[PDB]
From a paper:
RyR1 is the primary Ca2+ release channel of the sarcoplasmic reticulum (SR) in skeletal muscle, where SR Ca2+ release plays a crucial role in triggering muscle contractions. Using cryogenic electron microscopy (cryo-EM), previous structural studies revealed the homotetrameric architecture of the 2.3 MDa RyR1 channels exhibiting a mushroom-like shape that consists of a huge cytosolic shell (head) and a C-terminal pore region (stalk) spanning the SR membrane. While the cytosolic shell is mainly formed by a large α-solenoid network interspersed with globular domains, the transmembrane domain (TMD) possesses a 6-transmembrane-helix architecture (helices S1–S6) typical for cation channels, including a pseudo-voltage sensor domain (pVSD) (S1–S4) and the inner pore (S5–S6). To solve the structure of simvastatin binding sites on RyR1, we chromatographically purified endogenous RyR1 channels from mouse skeletal muscle tissues.
Residue numbers in the entry:
A (entry chain A): 679 to 727
B (entry chain A): 1648 to 1876, 1923 to 2047, 2089 to 2398, 2411 to 2566
C (entry chain E): 2 to 108
D (entry chain A): 3635 to 3737, 3752 to 4019
E (entry chain A): 244 to 630
Write the structure that this text describes.
């Protein structure tokens, strides 16, 4: 699976990506919820989109 | 998403997912390689390999994923290889020549107490290779039409890596079982061992393990017995019954390998010994020919052997087990001693020739099975059956070899490629025995049968085909489709037609093939209650081919089979064909078309090699008179119009549409009722004429022969025969402007109908008075001869009617004139 | 169709030519994002010859536009993919495919 | 012949190898005598480390032989339409049957010792449920002849030889406890399938033998087809021997049971079934005598068929004698009212005429002695 | 209404079972005697053998079964000895007639006619009629004697149960048809009262009757119980109880819910609608479970079963019936179709993740070691790609 690397900001209360499973197909990081906003070089990530 | 390992506590999801894996296995079960390729997209190779090693996976999911891997990637190949593993086609190559019963060793090159490691060494028996295709879902889809594309191969998975992983996992399981931890992989010893053992057994049967891998497996099973010239093997680990069953499967594989090694060693010794015997016979013939031959009696006695059949020569040359002189068996003492030594070696290897540790596979299996039975009251019937089968094989080793030899066969090197192709086709046919017939299966069956029939090995090794049981497999497929909706119109008529073309040539290839197929005559006659509409070869054709021109089989025929055929004929003579009625034909009250087929079979049963078989002829005549409806409505006693009137009415029917067919056509409007009636009556007259007794019996005055001839004469009047023979035929003519007005041979009165009447007249009544000879010549024969002569012009020479008239004259009429 | 969107740059010079064997690593997903194929799962690069109609038209054209060492996303429409027939059991009828293809080498 | 001169040294190597394999299997392997049945049965009967098992409970775990017999009993008791041919069962039944050997003037002590040895060998099996297994397999055969029922009958004969009263008691108790009609229905069906002399089959076989060879013996069949006349004479003898051994020793209870099964919903008179088969055989023998009456001398094939029929008739007569001896008054009355008298009349006619016919040629002295 | 001599598998069915009823209540179970007048009752239909002036030998209703019409006797021979009279005995009496052995001629007492077979009608052999109509004739034939064969207690009890259950369920069907299409508005149900309590009790009793043997049993006992269960299932199916259950299910399925049923039958009756429907499905499952012959009947009306899978009142019961049919019958597997497979998958879609639906789909693929490629492909194509 392609290596994941994202940079951005996250909100203190609400951003809690626990190891393992989660939203979508897991591997939740910056921008995989509505509490964080990430950049991976090609896309802007937020809300797992 | 969650971690799949959460299903250890989420039990509803665990159950649903385990049943989902079961569904995957079901949808790809029994050779559905297309669905296996599809499933490779849903459970990929990485997932399967990870699940194999996942030690925290719940037991049900671990077992399900092991079984899913086997089903997707290994099940088809394992089944195909297993189907072939019971036969030993040994090519006579140097590798085969090098095979010996016992390994060459310092203690003794042959005969030593130490066997070689089972499943390790050189094996030459032919086994077709495994075929796989890569899983890939970006390739261009083949535009080729469905039911025509080659059957999908099983999806590939790296076999070297898989086998290494399986061996490592089995070793780890053995070590952990030794340690006796409280958290077994999968939740229990069964869930830890059974999946790994199943994978190992599957790979072993597939034959992908190397010699080193097999040695590792044997050392895991029993470190001491299989030591090479932890200290506790699997066989002593206090294991559950399912694990014991898997161990029994492994032991079964290794015992099968030992049996195969015995068979191959016997084949190699047979090659060398047969070479020596042939050389000795050649030398002895040279000496005999170069001798002065002082005593003609001595020369004749010596040449008796060399005039005997080769099989008898071999039997005589080998008949020295209990001693023999140089006259009852001229084989030299050296060659005799070589055979005796090999026999002693074979007995020693089987254990026939005659410690707390076994020291051999046979002793190990015997002791293990007995110890298990002594230690527990085994509850699994499958386990009980497996262990007692293993015990029987260990105790009767010579019997196992004796029962396996009928399936052994040696071939020359030049036949190896064609034998491999034939084995591939036979594997496909066998694989089609576990799937309901469809269009794709029908196409595959037809293609495989065609390849087999075009293969040379099929014709040159009929004994090999019989040993492989090809005919039985083809018959099983045919009877499966025929039984499928027996009352309903059978589907796959093309595949049934091929089911003859194969079996129905197979009878012809050799006399032993004919006898083997004759052994299934009742089954064929059981399934031959239908057909006709096939417009092709049928199981009734198989039945006919299984007895045609074989006096021994015709005499072996059974009155029960003849009665069954006669009952079919009675039904045909009493009821119209429902298929024709559905097609829209007029209802005439009976089934001449089926009646003709049954009459043809009876003809082949009663007439052999140009002579009548008296027993079958008398039985058939008695059955026919006991069921008078078999004679057709015309020969009915009370209201019958007679044969001549029936033929004339049939001619009128043929001339009148809306009475000859539906009148609303794959081959000549399918069937024409007038022609069908004429053909039925011609076939009946032919059958009766062939049942007529022989002239030598009549001269001897046998009461049975005289009675049968009297019955036949009462059945068929002479005047009717003469009238039918005198009926005019429609000859080709020229009309309009160069238009060839020809009769429709499939819908009109043809000379083949007169041929049966001539045969009956010659065999039952005969021509003995000059006045009768001249009368029949003037009314019936001469007009036909003149028509045939007149049709000799360049335009009419090759017409269908002209050729039929030539055949009629040269097969029925002219020979009778020469005789008279 | 096929749209090619670069993910990581290639050399920018070496492009596949007809008859050359492209060795690639790919992951295939449906438009909605469900993965259905991956050569990285089998840990073996996929090799195909250009112009031999071995792969789908979208793959042929997209990998033709791709350069050696480049990673790119190919968005292939139904007509350039398995179309109306689809791939029974894998790809639904009339499905747009998304591939993450890396052109490892040419040989 | 001399023109043909087909030599073995000209055959292709692989064909010669196949022929050698066939001949070697036929003459060297098949002829080899290897007795393992007694050793196997002893090994399976021996229990091991019962002290370690500490099976002080009254219910001892079955030993390996007991477990094998129980497995076959379960297979027989399974509800199915037909009894599938089981090679394992046939092999183990043969082993068990051979384990009971049933082996000049021998002393009274020697005879008693032989009887006790046979009794012990039979007890090794019937203490493990072999008798009930035999009855269950006979019932499961559902009147269909074949290798399964042949092996079952042979095993039953082996365990009943000498009139084993304990085996008879076990079989009778099992039958009367189960009250199942299938056992005697199967017995009656098998008896009805038993064949007699067939003159049409005899004539067909004569013609087949008359047919000669013109090619190699391997290519031709050699007309060695299995006998067509009384081909199942061995099975018939085994069936009637088993029925006789059920009553051997004047077992009044089993003699009465063979006539009427009081507890069952329906009963079958095996005595009258035996009489019916005897009548059929007598009529066949009379037909054979009429066939050969005109001929001056009976050929070898006819003599062999006569001998087979006479052996079967001897077994049937012994069975009837065991049915009635003791005496069983009910069986005596049933036979007296049966068609036995007609069979005896026909047999007397055949005996009277064949005695005089055979006395006129010393080449048939053996057949006359048998008659 | 007509009597026949038939010798096929009917010799093991319930329609060939008769009860001999002497013309007296006290000591009716005494030994039967030659010449003793008696009635012959058909167990499964409750009708009595008798002679009618217009039709001859028939089976009549108990209401019309008076002695003159329905009185018969067994005679050792056809000689005219009936002049000899007979007197009733207060006890078991002398044993005269024996099962199996005794050959008896049946004589109609009032007329003296002998029970015999009608002259073989022409074309019956051609039609395949192996059954010969029975008649009462003045002379008869020499082979008219009959043998009395005992039947098992299981068969006798099953025949009586079939008679009573057929009566009850036919009454239930008539009651439903009474108000089939007559809305009650707010008034009375407008029909005949329904035997709700009797139907429920009968269904429960029959479910217990057809309950399969417990797996915690010895092999021999389990095999005997399985044999008995299969025989009883075959008896009921051959007497047509399966068709009756299907008819009841149809009548009740005409209504979609308990309230809809109440709109025609009343609230009190509708209080048992769901219970009766579920019990009927349970009885159907018990009647076909493990019986290939009974399961193969659905190969002709599979749509009848599949179309009901989405009914919410008896979802599990209907699924169980389908599971039994598919597990036992390859014939149904060979006629399964894409619409059926789609309905079964829609069951997963609409009812949740139930492993029993997956089991049904699995059983659709392989039966008795033979795979159905069409079913496998259809399941793969309609279930997997959606993900």
């Amino acid at each position: 699976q392609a290596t994941h690397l994202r940079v951005g900001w996250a909100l203190s209360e609400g951003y809690s990506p626990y190891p393992g499973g989660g939203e979508g197909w897991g591997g939740n990081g910056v921008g995989d919820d509505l509490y964080s906003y990430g950049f991976d070089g090609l896309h802007l990530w937020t809300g797992h989109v | 998403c969650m971690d799949i390992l959460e299903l250890s506590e989420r039990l509803d999801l665990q159950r649903f997912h385990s049943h989902t894996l079961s569904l995957y296995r079901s949808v790809c079960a029994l050779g559905n390689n297309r669905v296996a390729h599809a499933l490779c997209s849903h459970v990929d190779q990485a997932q399967l390999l990870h699940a194999l090693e996942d030690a925290r996976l719940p037991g049900p999911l671990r077992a399900g994923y092991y079984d899913l891997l086997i089903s997707i990637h290994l099940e088809s190949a394992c089944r195909s290889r297993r189907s072939m593993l019971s036969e030993y086609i040994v090519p006579l190559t140097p590798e085969t020549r090098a095979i010996t019963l016992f390994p060459p060793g310092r203690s003794a090159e042959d005969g030593p107490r130490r066997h070689g490691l089972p499943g390790v060494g050189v094996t030459t028996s032919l086994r077709p290779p495994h075929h796989f295709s890569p899983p890939c879902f970006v390739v261009a889809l083949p535009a080729a039409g469905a039911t025509e594309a080659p059957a999908r191969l099983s999806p590939a998975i790296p076999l070297e890596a898989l086998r290494d992983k399986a061996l490592r996992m089995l070793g780890e399981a053995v070590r952990d079982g030794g340690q006796h931890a409280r958290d077994p992989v999968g939740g229990s010893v069964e869930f830890q061992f059974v999946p790994v053992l199943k994978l190992v057994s599957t790979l072993l049967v597939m034959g992908v393990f190397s010699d080193e891998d097999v040695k590792q497996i044997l050392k895991m099973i029993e470190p001491e017995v299989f030591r090479e010239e932890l200290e506790e093997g699997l066989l002593q680990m206090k294991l559950p019954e399912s694990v014991k069953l898997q161990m029994c499967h492994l032991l079964e594989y290794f015992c099968d390998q030992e049996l195969q090694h015995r068979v191959e060693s016997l084949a190699a010794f047979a090659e060398c010994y047969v070479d020596k015997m042939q050389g000795n016979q050649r030398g002895r013939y040279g000496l005999l020919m170069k001798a002065f031959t002082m005593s003609a009696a001595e020369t004749a006695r010596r040449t008796r052997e060399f005039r005997s059949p080769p099989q008898e020569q071999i039997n005589m040359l080998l008949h020295f087990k209990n001693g023999a002189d140089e006259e009852e068996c001229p084989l030299p003492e050296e060659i005799r001693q070589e055979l005796v030594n090999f026999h002693q070696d074979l007995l020693a290897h089987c254990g026939i020739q005659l410690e707390h540790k076994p020291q051999s596979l046979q002793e190990l299996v015997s002791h293990t099975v007995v110890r298990w039975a002594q230690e527990d009251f085994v509850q699994s019937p499958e386990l009980v059956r497996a262990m007692f089968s293993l015990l029987h094989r260990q105790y009767d080793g010579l019997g196992e070899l004796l029962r396996a030899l009928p399936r052994a066969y040696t071939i020359s090197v030049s036949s190896v490629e064609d034998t491999m192709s034939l084995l591939e086709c036979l594997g496909q046919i066998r694989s089609l025995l576990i799937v309901q017939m469809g269009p794709q299966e029908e196409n595959l069956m037809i293609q495989s049968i065609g390849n087999i029939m075009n293969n040379k090995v099929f014709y040159q090794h009929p004994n090999l085909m019989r040993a492989l049981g090809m005919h039985e497999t083809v018959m099983e497929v045919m009877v499966n489709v025929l039984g499928g909706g027996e009352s309903k119109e059978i589907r796959f008529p093309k595949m049934v037609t091929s089911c003859c073309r194969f079996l129905c040539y197979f009878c012809r290839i050799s006399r032993q093939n004919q006898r083997s197929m004759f052994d299934h005559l009742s089954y064929l006659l059981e399934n031959s209650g239908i057909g006709l509409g096939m417009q092709g070869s049928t199981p009734l054709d198989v039945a006919a081919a299984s007895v045609i021109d074989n006096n021994e089989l015709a005499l072996a025929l059974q009155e029960q089979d003849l009665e069954k055929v006669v009952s079919y004929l009675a039904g045909c003579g009493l009821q119209s064909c429902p298929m024709l009625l559905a097609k829209g034909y007029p209802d005439i009250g009976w089934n001449p078309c089926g009646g003709e087929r049954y009459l043809d079979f009876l003809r082949f049963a009663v007439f052999v090699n140009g002579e009548s078989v008296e027993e079958n002829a008398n039985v058939v005549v008695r059955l026919l008179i006991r069921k008078p409806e078999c004679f057709g409505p015309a020969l009915r006693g009370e209201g019958g119009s007679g044969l001549l009137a029936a033929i004339e009415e049939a001619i009128r029917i043929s001339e009148d549409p809306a009475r000859d067919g539906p009148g609303v056509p794959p081959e000549e409007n399918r069937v024409h009722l007038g022609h069908a009636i004429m053909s039925f009556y011609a076939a009946l007259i032919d059958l009766l004429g062939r049942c007529a007794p022989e002239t030598h019996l009549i001269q001897a005055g046998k009461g049975e022969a005289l009675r049968i001839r009297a019955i036949l004469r009462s059945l068929v009047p002479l005047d009717d025969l003469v009238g039918i023979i005198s009926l005019p035929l429609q000859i080709p003519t020229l009309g309009k402007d160069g238009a060839l007005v020809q009769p429709k041979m499939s819908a009109s009165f043809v000379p083949d109908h007169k041929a049966s009447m001539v045969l009956f007249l010659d065999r039952v009544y005969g021509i003995e008075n000059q006045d009768f000879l001249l009368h029949v010549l003037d009314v019936g024969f001469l007009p036909d001869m003149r028509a045939a002569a007149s049709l000799d012009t360049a335009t009419f020479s090759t017409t269908e009617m002209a050729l039929a008239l030539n055949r009629y004259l040269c097969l029925a009429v002219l020979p009778l004139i020469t005789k008279c | 169709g096929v749209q090619v969107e670069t993910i990581s740059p290639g050399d920018g010079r070496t492009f596949p030519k007809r008859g050359q064997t492209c060795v690639v690593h790919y992951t295939g997903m449906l438009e909605d994002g469900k993965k259905f194929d991956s050569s990285r799962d089998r840990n073996k690069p996929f090799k195909f010859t250009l112009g031999k109609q071995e792969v789908i038209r979208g793959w042929e054209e997209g990998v033709a536009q791709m350069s050696v060492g480049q990673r790119a996303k190919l968005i292939i429409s139904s007509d350039y993919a398995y179309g109306a027939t689809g791939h029974p059991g894998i790809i639904p009828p009339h499905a747009t495919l998304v591939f993450d293809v890396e052109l490892l080498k040419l040989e | 012949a001399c023109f043909r001169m087909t030599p073995l040294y000209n055959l292709p190597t692989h064909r010669a190898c196949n022929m050698f394999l066939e001949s070697y299997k036929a003459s060297w392997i098949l002829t080899e005598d290897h007795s393992f049945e007694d050793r196997m049965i002893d090994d399976l009967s021996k229990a091991g480390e019962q002290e370690e098992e500490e099976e002080e409970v009254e219910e001892k775990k079955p030993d390996p032989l007991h477990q094998l017999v129980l497995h076959f009993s379960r297979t027989a008791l399974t509800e199915k339409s037909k009894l599938d041919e089981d090679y394992l069962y046939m092999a183990y039944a043969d082993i068990m049957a051979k384990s009971c050997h049933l082996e000049v003037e021998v002393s009274f002590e020697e005879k008693e010792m032989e009887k006790q040895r046979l009794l012990y060998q039979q007890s090794r099996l019937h203490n493990r449920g072999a008798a009930e297994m035999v009855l269950q397999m006979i019932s499961a055969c559902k009147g269909e002849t074949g290798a399964m029922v042949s092996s079952t009958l042979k095993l039953g004969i082996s365990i009943l030889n000498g009139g084993n009263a304990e085996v008879q008691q076990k079989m009778l108790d099992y039958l009367k406890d189960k009250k199942e009609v299938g056992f005697f229905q199967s017995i009656q069906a098998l008896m009805q399938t038993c064949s007699v002399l067939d003159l049409n089959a005899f004539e067909r076989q004569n013609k087949a033998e008359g047919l000669g060879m013109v090619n190699e013996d391997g290519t031709v069949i050699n007309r060695q087809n299995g006998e067509k006349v009384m081909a199942d004479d061995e099975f018939t003898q085994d069936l009637f021997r088993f029925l006789q051994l059920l009553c051997e020793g004047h077992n009044n209870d089993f003699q009465n049971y063979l006539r009427t099964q009081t507890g069952n919903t329906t009963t079958i008179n095996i005595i009258i079934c035996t009489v019916d088969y005897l009548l059929r055989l007598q009529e066949s023998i009379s037909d054979f005598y009429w066939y050969y009456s005109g001929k001056d001398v009976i050929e070898e094939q006819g003599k062999r068929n006569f001998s087979k029929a006479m052996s079967v008739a001897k077994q049937v007569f012994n069975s009837l004698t065991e049915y009635i001896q003791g005496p069983c008054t009910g069986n005596q009355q049933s036979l007296a009212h049966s068609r036995l008298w007609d069979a005896v009349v026909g047999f007397l006619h055949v005996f009277a005429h064949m005695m005089m016919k055979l006395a006129q040629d010393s080449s048939q002295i053996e057949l006359l002695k048998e008659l | 209404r007509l009597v026949y001599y038939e010798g096929g598998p009917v010799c093991t069915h319930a329609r060939s079972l008769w009860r001999l009823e002497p013309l007296r209540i006290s000591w009716s179970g005494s030994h039967l005697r030659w010449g003793q007048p008696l009635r012959i009752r058909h167990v499964t239909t409750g009708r009595y053998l008798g002679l009618t002036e217009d039709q001859g030998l028939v089976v009549v209703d108990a209401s019309k079964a008076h002695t003159k019409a329905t009185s018969f006797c067994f005679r050792i021979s056809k000689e005219k000895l009936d002049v000899a009279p007979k007197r009733d005995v207060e006890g078991m009496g002398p044993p005269e007639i024996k099962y199996g052995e005794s050959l008896c001629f049946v004589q109609h007492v009032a007329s003296g006619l002998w029970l015999t077979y009608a002259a073989p009608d022409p074309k019956a052999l051609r039609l395949g009629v192996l059954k010969k109509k029975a008649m009462l004739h003045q002379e008869g034939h020499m082979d008219d004697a009959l043998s009395l064969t005992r039947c098992q207690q299981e068969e006798s009890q099953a025949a009586r149960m079939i008679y009573s259950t057929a009566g009850l369920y036919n009454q239930f069907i008539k009651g439903l048809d009474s108000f089939s299409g007559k809305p009650r508005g707010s008034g009375p149900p407008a029909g005949s009262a329904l035997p709700i309590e009797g139907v429920i009790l009968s269904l429960q009793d029959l479910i217990g009757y057809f309950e399969p043997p417990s797996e915690e049993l010895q092999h021999e006992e389990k095999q005997t119980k399985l044999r008995s269960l299969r025989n009883r299932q075959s008896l009921f199916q051959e007497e047509g109880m399966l068709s009756l259950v299907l008819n009841c299910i149809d009548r009740l399925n005409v209504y979609t819910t308990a309230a809809h049923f109440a709109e025609f039958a009343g609230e009190e009756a509708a209080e048992s609608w769901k219970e009766i429907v579920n019990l009927l499905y349970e009885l159907l499952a018990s009647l076909i479970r493990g019986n290939r012959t009974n399961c193969a009947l659905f190969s002709t009306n599979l749509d009848w079963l599949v179309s009901k899978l989405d009914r919410l009142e008896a979802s599990s019961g209907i699924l169980e019936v389908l599971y039994c049919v598919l597990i036992e019958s390859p014939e149904v597997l060979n006629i399964i179709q894409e619409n059926h497979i789609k309905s079964i998958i829609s069951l997963l879609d609409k009812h949740g993740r139930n492993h029993k639906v997956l089991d049904v789909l699995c059983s659709l693929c392989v039966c008795n070691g033979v795979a159905v490629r069409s079913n496998q492909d259809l399941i793969t194509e309609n279930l997997l790609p959606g993900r």
